[PDB]
Every structure is written in structure tokens, then in C-alpha cells.
Predict the structure of Tetur07g02040.
Amino acid sequence: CSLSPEVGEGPYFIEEDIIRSNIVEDRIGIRLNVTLNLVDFNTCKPIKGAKVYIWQPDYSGIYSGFMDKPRVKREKMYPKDPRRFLRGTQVTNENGTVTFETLFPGHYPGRTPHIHYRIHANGNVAHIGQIFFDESTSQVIQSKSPYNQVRMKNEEDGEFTYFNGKKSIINIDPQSLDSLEGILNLAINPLHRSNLMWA
Ligand SMILES: [Fe+3]
């Protein structure tokens, strides 16, 4: 129960209700279950009814909707393809929990591997961030197929450094090396209006 850090949205958010737990579609990689537990910063009690969005690139660093890897611009970015793999939304339960069935993310050049997330509560964009991986685990996974077929360090990454990525690393249960299980506990502020959206 300390306020989780926020991190810039980047350019590839797509504001669509795709409410599902399994976001893999046709993508290939290593299965990762991402469980996020949300509490209200103020009370430390779980937050119920919050919409959690995640989005991430596939193993070779492609984002669905931006598969033609277009030029990035400060002005509002619009997806060209209709694919939505590796994107989803889940609504927190009584316990403040959502779980997604995803893959370990690939990454871009000039970025460390991560999964984005954005949370709506009370019709406000309450919190935007990024999920990072412990260096040892990331190294293990990147040595396996298909991740090893195409890496900026956490500490080289502008976003990780500037926005406290250290407090935003997902905890992977090591014995889960059938499918990986990851837990990240977050404390957010449902009254906060984030200003970290791309537009
Ligand atoms: Fe990204």
C-alpha cells in the first residue's frame, strides 16, 4: 500500500472493449498468466468494478493494429489493421483482481520488454503504467524459442529509469516454469485523472 508509479502510455493504446481473459489469438510464444491485484491507495481496500486494459507486442515486437510498424507522431495515432491480438480488458472482481492469459512479450528496439496497462474507474482514466520483468527471468525467456530468433537493458530504458520501473516489476512464481504465473499488486487512486495518455 504505496501509490504505484505511473508510466507513459506510449503510442499504441487502442481504446476498445475487448473483454476477455485470453488475448493470445494466433501469436506464438511462452504462455504467461498475468494476475493484477488493485487496491485503493487511500484505504488499501480492493477496488471493485475497475476496467483494466493491457496491451503488449508479440515475440518479434509487433503491436496489433500497428502491424505495418508506422512512423510515430505526437498527434493522435490511429490503427490501420483490424487485428487486436495481445490486447484485452478485464473488470476487477470483489477482491480487486483480474487475470489475463497472455504471452511473455517481445520488444522493440530502444525499449526493454514490457506490458502496458491502463485502468478506468468511475469513468476516469485513473492510472496508466507499464509492467516490467526481473532481469534474470527475462534473460531465461529470451534464450528460448521463439524469443531468441530476432535487447535494450532496463537501466538503459528512458521510461524504466524516469518513471520508477523498479516498483513495477511483475513477480513470477519460479516453479511455474505448464504456464508461467505472474502477480503484480498495484495501489492506485480512483479519483486521480491520469495525464499520461498519448493524446
Ligand atoms: Fe510498448
